[PDB]
Short mmCIF file of N, CA, C and O in Angstrom, two decimals:
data_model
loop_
_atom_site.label_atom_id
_atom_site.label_comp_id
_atom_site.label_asym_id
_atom_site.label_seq_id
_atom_site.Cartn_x
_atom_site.Cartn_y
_atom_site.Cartn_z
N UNK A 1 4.67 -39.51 -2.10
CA UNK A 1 4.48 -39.84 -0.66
C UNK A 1 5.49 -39.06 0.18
O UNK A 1 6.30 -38.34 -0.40
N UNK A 2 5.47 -39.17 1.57
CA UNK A 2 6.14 -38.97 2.30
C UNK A 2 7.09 -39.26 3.24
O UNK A 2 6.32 -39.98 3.88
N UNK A 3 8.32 -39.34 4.03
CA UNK A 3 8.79 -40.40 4.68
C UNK A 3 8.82 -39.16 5.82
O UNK A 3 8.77 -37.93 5.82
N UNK A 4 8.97 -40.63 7.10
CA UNK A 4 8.81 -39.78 8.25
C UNK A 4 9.73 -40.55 9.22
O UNK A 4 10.19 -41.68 9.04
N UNK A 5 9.94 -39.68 10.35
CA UNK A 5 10.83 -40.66 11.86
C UNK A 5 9.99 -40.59 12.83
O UNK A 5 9.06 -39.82 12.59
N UNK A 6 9.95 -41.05 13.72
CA UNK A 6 8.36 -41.50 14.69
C UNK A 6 9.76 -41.70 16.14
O UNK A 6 10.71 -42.39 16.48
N UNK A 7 9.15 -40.82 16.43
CA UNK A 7 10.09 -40.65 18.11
C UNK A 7 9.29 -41.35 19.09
O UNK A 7 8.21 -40.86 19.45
N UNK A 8 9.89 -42.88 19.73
CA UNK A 8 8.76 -43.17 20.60
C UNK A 8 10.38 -43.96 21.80
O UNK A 8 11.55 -43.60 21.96
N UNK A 9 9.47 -45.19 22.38
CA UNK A 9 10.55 -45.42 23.80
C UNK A 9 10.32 -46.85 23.72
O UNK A 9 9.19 -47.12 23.32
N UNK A 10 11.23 -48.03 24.03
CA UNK A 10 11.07 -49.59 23.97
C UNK A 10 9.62 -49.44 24.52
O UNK A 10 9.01 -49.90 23.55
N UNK A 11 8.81 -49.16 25.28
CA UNK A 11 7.41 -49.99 25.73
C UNK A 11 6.98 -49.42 24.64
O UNK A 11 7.05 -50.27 23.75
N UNK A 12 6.56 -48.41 24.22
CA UNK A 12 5.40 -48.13 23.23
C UNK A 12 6.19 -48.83 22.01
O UNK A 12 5.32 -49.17 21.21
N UNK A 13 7.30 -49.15 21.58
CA UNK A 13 7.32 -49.89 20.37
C UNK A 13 6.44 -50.78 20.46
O UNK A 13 5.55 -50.91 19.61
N UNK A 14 6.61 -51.83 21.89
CA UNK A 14 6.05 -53.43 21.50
C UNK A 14 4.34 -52.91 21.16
O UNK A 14 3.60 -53.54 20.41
N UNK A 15 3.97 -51.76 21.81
CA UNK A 15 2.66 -51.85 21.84
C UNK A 15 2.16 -51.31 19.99
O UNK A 15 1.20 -51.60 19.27
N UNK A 16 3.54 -50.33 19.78
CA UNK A 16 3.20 -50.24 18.01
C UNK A 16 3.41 -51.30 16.83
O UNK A 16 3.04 -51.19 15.67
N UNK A 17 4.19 -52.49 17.51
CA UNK A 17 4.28 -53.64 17.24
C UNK A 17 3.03 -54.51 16.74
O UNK A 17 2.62 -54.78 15.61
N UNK A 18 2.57 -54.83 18.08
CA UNK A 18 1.77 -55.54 18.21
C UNK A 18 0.06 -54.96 17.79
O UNK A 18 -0.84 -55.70 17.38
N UNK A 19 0.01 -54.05 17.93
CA UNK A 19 -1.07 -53.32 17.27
C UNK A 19 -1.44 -52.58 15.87
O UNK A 19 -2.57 -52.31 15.45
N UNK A 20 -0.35 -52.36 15.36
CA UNK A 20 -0.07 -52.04 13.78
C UNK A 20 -0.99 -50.48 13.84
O UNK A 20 -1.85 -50.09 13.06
N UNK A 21 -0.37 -49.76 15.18
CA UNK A 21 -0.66 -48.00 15.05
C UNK A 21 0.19 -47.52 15.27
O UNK A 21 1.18 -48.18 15.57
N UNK A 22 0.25 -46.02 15.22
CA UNK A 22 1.15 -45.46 15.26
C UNK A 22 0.60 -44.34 15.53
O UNK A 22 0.11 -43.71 14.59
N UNK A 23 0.53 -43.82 16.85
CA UNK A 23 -0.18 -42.27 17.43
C UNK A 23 0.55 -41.30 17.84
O UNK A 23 1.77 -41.34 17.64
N UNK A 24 -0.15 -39.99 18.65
CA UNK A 24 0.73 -38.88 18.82
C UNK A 24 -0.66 -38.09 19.61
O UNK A 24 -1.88 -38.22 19.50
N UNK A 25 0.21 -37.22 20.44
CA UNK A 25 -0.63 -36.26 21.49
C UNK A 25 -1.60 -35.37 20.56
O UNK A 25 -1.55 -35.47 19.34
N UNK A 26 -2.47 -34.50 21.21
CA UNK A 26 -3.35 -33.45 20.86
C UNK A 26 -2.51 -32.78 20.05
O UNK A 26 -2.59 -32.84 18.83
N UNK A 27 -1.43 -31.92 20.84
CA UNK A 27 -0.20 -30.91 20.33
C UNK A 27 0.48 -31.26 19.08
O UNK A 27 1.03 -30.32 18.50
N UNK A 28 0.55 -32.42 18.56
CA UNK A 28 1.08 -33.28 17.67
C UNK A 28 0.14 -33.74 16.55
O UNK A 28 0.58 -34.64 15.84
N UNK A 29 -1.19 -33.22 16.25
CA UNK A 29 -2.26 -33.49 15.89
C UNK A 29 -2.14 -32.95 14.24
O UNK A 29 -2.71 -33.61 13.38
N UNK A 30 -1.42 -31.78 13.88
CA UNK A 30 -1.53 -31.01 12.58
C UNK A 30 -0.26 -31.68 11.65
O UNK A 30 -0.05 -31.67 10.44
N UNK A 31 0.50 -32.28 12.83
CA UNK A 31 1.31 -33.06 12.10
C UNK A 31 0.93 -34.30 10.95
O UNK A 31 1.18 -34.60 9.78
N UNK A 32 0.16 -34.76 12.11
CA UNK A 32 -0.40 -36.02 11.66
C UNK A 32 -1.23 -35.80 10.72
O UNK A 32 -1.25 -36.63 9.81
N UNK A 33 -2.40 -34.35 10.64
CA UNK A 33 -2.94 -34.79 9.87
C UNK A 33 -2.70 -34.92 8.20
O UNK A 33 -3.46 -35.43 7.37
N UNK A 34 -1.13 -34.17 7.96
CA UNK A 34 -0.45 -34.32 7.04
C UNK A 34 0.01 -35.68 6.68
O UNK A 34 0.86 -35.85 5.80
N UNK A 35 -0.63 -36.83 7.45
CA UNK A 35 0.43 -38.11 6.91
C UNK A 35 -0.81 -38.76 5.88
O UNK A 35 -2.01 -38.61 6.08
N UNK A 36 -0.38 -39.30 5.06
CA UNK A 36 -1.60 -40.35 3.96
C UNK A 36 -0.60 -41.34 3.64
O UNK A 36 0.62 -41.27 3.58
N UNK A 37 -1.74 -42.60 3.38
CA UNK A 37 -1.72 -44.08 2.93
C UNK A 37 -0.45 -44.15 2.04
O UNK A 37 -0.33 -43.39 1.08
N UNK A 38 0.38 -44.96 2.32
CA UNK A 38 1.42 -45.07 1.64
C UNK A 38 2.60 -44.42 2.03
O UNK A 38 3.68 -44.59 1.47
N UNK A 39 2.37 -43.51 3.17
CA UNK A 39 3.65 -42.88 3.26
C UNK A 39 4.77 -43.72 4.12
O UNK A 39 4.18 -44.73 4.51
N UNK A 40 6.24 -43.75 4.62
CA UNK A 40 6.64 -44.90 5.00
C UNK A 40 6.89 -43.82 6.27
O UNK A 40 6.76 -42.60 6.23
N UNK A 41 7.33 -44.72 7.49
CA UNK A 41 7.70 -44.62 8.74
C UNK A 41 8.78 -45.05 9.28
O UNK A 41 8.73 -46.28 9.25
N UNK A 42 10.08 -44.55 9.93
CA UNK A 42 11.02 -45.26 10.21
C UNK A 42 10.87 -44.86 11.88
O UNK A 42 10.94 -43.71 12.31
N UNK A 43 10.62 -46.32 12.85
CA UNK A 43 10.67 -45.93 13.92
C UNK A 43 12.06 -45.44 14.25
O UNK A 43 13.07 -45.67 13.58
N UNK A 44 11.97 -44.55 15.66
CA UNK A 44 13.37 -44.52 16.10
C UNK A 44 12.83 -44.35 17.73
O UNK A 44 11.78 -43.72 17.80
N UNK A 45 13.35 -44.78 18.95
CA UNK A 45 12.96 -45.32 20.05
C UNK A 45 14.23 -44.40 20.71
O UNK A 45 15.31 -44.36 20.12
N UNK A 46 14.09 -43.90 21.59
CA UNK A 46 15.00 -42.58 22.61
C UNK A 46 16.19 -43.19 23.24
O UNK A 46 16.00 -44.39 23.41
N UNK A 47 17.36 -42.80 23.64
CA UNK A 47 18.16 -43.32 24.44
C UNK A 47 17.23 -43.35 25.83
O UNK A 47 16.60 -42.32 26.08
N UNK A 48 17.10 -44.56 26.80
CA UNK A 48 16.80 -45.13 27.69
C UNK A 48 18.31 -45.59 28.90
O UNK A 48 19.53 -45.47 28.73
N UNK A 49 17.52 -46.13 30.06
CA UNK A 49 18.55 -46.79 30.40
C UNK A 49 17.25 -48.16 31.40
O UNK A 49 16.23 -47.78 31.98
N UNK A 50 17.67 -49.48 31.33
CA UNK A 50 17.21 -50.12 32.22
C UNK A 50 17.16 -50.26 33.55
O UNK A 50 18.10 -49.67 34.08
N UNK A 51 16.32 -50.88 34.44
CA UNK A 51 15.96 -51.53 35.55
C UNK A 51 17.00 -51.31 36.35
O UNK A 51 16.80 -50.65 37.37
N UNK A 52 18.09 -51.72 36.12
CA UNK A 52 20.04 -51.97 36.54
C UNK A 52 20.31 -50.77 36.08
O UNK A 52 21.54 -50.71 35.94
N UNK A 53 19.84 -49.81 35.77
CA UNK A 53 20.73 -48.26 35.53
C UNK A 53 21.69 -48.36 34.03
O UNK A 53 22.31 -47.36 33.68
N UNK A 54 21.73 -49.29 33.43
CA UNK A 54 22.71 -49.40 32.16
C UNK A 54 21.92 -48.22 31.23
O UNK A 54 20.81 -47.77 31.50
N UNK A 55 22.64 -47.88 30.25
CA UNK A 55 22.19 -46.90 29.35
C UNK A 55 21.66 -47.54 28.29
O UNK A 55 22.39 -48.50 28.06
N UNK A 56 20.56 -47.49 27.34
CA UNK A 56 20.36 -48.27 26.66
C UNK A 56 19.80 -46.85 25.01
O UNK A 56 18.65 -46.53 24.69
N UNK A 57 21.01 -46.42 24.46
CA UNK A 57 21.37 -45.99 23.41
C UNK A 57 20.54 -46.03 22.07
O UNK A 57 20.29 -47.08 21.48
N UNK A 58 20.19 -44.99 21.71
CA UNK A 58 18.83 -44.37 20.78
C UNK A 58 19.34 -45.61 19.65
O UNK A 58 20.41 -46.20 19.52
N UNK A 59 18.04 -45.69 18.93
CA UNK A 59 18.33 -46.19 17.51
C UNK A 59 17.16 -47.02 16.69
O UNK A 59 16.25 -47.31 17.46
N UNK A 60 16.99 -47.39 15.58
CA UNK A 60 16.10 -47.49 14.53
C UNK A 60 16.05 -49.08 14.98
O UNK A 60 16.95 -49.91 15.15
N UNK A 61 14.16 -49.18 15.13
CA UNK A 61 13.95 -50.55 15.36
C UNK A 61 13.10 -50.58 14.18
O UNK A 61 12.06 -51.02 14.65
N UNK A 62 12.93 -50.41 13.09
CA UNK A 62 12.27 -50.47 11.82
C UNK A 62 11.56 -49.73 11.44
O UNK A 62 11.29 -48.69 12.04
N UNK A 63 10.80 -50.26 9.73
CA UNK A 63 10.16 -49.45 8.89
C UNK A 63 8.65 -49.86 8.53
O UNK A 63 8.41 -50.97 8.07
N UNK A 64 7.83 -49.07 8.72
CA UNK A 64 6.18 -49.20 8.18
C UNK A 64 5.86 -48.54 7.21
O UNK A 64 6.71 -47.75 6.78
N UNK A 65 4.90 -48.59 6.72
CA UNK A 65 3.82 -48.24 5.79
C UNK A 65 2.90 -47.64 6.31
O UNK A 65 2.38 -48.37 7.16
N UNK A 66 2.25 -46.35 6.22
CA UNK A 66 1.16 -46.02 6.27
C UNK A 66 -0.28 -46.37 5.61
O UNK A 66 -0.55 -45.85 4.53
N UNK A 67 -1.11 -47.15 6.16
CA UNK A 67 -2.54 -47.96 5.17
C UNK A 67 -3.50 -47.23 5.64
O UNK A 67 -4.45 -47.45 4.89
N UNK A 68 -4.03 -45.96 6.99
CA UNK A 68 -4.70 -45.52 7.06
C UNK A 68 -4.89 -44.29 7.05
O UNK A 68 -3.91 -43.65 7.43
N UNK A 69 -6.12 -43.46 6.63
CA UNK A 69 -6.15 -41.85 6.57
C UNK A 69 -6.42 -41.76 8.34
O UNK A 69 -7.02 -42.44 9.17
N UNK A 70 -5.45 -40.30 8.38
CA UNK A 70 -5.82 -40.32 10.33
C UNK A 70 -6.73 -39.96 11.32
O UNK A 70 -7.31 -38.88 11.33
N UNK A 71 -6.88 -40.79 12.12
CA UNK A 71 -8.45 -40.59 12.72
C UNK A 71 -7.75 -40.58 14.39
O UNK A 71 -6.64 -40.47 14.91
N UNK A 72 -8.95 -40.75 14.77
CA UNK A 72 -9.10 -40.70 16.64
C UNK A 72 -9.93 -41.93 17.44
O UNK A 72 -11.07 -42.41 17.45
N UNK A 73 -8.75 -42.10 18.03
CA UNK A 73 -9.38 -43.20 18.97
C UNK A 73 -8.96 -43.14 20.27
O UNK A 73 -7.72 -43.16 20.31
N UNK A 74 -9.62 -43.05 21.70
CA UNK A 74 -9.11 -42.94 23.17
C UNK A 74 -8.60 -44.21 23.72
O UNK A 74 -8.32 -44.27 24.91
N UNK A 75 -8.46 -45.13 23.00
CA UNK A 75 -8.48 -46.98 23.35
C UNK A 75 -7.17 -46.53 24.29
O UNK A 75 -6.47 -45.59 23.93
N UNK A 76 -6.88 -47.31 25.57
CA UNK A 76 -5.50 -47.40 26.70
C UNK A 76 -4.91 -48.28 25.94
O UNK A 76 -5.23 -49.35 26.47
N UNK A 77 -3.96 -48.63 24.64
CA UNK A 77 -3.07 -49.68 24.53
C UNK A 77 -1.76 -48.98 24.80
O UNK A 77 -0.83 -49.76 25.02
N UNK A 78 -1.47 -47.70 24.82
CA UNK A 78 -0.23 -46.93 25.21
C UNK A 78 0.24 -46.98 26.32
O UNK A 78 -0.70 -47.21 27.09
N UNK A 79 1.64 -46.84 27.15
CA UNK A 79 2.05 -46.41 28.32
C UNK A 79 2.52 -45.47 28.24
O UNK A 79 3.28 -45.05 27.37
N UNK A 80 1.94 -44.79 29.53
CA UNK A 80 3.04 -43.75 29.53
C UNK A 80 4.01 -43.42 30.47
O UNK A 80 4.81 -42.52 30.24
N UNK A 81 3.18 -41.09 35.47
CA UNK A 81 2.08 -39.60 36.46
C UNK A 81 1.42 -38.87 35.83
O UNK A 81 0.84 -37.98 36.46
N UNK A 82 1.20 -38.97 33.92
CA UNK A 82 0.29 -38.68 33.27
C UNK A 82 -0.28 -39.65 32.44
O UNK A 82 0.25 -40.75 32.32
N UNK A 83 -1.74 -39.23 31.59
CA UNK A 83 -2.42 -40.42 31.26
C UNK A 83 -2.76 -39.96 30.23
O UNK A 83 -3.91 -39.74 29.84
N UNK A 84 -1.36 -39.69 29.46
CA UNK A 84 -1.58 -39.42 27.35
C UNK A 84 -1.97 -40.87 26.89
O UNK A 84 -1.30 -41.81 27.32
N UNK A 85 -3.18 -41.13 25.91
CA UNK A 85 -3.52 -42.11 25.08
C UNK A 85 -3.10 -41.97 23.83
O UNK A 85 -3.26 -42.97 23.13
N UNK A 86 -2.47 -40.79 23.17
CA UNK A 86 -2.22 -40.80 21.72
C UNK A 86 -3.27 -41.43 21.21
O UNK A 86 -3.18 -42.61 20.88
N UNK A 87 -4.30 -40.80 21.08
CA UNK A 87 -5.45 -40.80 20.39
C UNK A 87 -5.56 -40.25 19.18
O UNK A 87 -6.61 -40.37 18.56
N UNK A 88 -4.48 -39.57 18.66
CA UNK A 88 -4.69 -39.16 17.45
C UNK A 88 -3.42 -40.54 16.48
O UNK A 88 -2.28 -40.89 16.78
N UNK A 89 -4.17 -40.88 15.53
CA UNK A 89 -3.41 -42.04 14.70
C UNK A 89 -3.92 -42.67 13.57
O UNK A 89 -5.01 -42.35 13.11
N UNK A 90 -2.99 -43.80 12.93
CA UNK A 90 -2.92 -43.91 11.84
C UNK A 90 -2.60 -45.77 11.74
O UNK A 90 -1.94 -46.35 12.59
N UNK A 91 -3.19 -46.44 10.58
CA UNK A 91 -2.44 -47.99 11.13
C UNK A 91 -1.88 -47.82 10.02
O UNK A 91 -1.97 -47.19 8.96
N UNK A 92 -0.97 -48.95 10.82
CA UNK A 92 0.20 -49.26 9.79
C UNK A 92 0.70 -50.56 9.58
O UNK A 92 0.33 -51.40 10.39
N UNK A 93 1.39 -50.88 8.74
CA UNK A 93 1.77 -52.27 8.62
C UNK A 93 3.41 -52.23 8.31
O UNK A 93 4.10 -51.38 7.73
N UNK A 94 3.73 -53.49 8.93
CA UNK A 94 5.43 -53.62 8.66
C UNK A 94 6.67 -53.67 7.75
O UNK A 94 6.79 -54.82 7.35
N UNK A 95 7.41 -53.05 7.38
CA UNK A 95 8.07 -52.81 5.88
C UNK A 95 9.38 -53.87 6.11
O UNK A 95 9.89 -54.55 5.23
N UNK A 96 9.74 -53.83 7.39
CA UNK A 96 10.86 -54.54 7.65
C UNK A 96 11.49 -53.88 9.42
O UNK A 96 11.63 -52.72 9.83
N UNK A 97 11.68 -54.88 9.90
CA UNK A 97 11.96 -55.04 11.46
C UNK A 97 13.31 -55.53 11.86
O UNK A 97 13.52 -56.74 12.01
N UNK A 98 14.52 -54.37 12.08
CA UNK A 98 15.53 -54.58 13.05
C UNK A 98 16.02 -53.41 13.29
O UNK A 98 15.36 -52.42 13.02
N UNK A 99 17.14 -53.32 13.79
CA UNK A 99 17.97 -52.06 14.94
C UNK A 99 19.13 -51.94 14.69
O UNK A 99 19.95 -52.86 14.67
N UNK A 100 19.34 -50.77 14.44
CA UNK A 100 20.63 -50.07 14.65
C UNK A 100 20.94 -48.96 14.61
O UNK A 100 20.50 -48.11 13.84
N UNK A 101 22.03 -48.80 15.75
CA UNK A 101 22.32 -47.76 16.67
C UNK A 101 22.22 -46.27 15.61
O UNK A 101 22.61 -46.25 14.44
N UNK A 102 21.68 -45.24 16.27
CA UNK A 102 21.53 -44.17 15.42
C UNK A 102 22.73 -42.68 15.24
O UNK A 102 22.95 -41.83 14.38
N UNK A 103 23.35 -43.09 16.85
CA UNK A 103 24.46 -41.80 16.55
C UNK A 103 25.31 -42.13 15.64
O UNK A 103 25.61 -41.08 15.08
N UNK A 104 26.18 -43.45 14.91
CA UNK A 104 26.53 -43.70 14.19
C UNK A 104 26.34 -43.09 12.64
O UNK A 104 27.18 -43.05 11.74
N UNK A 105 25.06 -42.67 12.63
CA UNK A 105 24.43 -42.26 11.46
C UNK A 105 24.43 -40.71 11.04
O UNK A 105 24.49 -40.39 9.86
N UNK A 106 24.34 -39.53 12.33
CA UNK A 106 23.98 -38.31 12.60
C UNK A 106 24.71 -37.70 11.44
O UNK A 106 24.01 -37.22 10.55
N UNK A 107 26.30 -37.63 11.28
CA UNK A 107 27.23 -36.95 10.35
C UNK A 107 26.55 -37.23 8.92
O UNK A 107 26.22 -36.35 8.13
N UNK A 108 26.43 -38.44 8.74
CA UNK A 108 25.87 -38.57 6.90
C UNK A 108 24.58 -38.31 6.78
O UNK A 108 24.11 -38.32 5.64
N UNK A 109 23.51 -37.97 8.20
CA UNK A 109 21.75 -37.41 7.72
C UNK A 109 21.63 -36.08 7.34
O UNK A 109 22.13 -35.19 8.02
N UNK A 110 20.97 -35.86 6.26
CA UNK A 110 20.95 -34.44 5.92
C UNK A 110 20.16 -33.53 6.94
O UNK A 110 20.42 -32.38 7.27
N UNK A 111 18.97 -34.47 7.41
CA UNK A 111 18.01 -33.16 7.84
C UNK A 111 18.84 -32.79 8.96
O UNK A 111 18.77 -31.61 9.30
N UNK A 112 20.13 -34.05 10.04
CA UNK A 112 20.11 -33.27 11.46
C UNK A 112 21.37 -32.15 11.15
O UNK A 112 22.49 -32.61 10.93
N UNK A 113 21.15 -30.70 11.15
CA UNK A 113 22.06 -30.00 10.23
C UNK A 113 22.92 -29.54 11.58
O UNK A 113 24.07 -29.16 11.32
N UNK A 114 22.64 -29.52 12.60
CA UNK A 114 23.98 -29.07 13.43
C UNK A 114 23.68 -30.57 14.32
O UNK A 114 22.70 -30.92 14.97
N UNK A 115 25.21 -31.36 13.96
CA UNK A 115 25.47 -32.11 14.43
C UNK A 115 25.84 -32.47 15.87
O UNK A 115 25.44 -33.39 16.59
N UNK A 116 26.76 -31.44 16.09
CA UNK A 116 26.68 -31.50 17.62
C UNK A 116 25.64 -31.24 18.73
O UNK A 116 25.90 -31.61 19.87
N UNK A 117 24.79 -30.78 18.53
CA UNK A 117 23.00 -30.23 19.20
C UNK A 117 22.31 -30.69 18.39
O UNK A 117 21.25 -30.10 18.20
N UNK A 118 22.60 -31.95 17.54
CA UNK A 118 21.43 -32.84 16.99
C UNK A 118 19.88 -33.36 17.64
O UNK A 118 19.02 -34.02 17.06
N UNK A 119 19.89 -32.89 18.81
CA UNK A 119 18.85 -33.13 19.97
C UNK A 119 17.88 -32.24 19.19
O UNK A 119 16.72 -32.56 18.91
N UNK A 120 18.42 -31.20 18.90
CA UNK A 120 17.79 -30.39 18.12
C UNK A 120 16.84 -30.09 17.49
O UNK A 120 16.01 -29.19 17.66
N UNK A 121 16.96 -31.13 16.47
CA UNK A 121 15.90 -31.58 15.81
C UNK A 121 14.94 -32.97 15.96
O UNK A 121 14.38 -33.69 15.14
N UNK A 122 15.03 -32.96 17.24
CA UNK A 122 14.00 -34.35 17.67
C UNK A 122 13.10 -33.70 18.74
O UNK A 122 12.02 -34.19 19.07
N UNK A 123 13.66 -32.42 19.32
CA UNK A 123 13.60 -31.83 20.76
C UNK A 123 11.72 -31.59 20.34
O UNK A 123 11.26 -31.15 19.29
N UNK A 124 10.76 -32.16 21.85
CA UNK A 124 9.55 -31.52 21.39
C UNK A 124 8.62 -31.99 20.22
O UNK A 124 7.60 -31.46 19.78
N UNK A 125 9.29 -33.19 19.84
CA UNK A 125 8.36 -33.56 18.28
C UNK A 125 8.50 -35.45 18.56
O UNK A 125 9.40 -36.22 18.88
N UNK A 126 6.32 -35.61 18.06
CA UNK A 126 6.30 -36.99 17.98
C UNK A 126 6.96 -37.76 16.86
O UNK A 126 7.49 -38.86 17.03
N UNK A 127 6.88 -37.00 15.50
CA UNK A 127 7.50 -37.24 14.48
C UNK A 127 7.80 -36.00 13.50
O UNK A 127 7.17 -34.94 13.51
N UNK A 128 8.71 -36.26 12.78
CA UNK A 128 8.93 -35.36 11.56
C UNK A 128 9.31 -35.76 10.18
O UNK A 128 9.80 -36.87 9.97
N UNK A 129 9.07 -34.73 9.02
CA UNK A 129 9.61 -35.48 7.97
C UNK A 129 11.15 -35.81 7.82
O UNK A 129 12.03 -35.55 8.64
N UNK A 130 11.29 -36.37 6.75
CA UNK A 130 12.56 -37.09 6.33
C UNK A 130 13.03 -36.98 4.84
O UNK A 130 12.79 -37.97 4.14
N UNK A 131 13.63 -35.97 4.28
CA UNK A 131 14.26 -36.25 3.22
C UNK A 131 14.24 -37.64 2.45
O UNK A 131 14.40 -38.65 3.13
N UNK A 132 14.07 -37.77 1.19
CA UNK A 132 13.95 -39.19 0.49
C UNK A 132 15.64 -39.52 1.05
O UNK A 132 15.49 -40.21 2.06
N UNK A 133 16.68 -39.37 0.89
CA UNK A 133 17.95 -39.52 0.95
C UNK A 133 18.31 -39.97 1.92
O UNK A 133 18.93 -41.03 1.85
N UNK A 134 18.03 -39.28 3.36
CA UNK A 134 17.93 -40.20 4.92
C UNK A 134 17.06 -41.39 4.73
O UNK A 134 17.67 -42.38 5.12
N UNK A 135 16.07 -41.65 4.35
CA UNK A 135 15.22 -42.43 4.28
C UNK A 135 15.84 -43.76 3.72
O UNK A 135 15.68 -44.92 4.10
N UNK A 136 16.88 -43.08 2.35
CA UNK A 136 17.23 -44.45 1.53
C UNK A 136 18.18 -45.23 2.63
O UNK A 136 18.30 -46.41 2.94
N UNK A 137 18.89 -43.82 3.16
CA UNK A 137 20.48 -44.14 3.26
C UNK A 137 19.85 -45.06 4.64
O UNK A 137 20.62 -46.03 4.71
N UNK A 138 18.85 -45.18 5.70
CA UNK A 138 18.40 -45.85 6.71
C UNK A 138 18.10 -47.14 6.39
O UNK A 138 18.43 -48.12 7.06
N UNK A 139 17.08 -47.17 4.75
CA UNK A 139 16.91 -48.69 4.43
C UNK A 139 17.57 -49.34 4.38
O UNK A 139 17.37 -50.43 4.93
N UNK A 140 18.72 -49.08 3.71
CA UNK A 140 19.56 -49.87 3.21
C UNK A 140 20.37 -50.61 4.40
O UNK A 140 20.68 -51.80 4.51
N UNK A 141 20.62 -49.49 5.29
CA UNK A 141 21.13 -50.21 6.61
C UNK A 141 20.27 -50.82 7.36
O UNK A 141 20.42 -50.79 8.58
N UNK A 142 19.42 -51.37 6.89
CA UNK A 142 17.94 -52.03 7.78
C UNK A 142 17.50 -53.47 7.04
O UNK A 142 16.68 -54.32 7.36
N UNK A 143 18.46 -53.35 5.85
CA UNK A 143 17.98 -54.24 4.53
C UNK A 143 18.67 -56.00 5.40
O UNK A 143 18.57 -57.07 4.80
#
């Protein structure tokens, strides 16, 4: 199988939450169609800041399973002055659900290889793969 990180923002979690998918734009499409049943998912949700201007700091709100081969659907359960549906997707089901902060982590992940411009490797992408080794070293802190 495969493991992957899924770049999304607090609203579209609840909606990947509550819906057990997990989508991505047109542009993002060859990615996906590389993902199959069984592969795992570790969300990770963007630094934000709230309502009140506070900063609200990147980091891992949990892990899924991949249960479907990937298909297309236009359904509005997404948010997004543009009107992306992430129509291209996959369902999934829950491996285990909580958070924690991700810059903490950057120095010991193998794939982000220049640490200081770690943006780097998130820059432009719905998801990417993940070394088995990031993957473990995330569970365990999720356990």
């Amino acid at each position: 199988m495969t493991y992957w990180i899924c770049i999304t923002n607090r609203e579209n979690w609840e909606v990947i939450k509550r819906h057990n998918v997990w989508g991505v734009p047109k542009k993002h499409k060859n990615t996906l169609s590389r993902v199959k049943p069984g592969d795992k998912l570790v969300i990770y949700v963007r630094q934000e800041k709230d309502k009140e201007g506070n900063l609200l700091e990147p980091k891992i709100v949990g892990i899924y399973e991949v249960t479907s081969e990937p298909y297309v659907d236009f359904s509005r359960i997404f948010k997004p002055g543009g009107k992306e549906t992430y129509p291209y997707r996959v369902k999934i089901k829950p491996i285990k659900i909580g958070e924690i902060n991700f810059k903490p982590l950057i120095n010991d992940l193998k794939f982000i290889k220049n640490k200081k411009r770690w943006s780097m490797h998130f820059f432009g992408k719905a998801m990417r793969e993940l070394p088995e080794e990031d993957y473990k070293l995330i569970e365990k802190l999720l356990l």
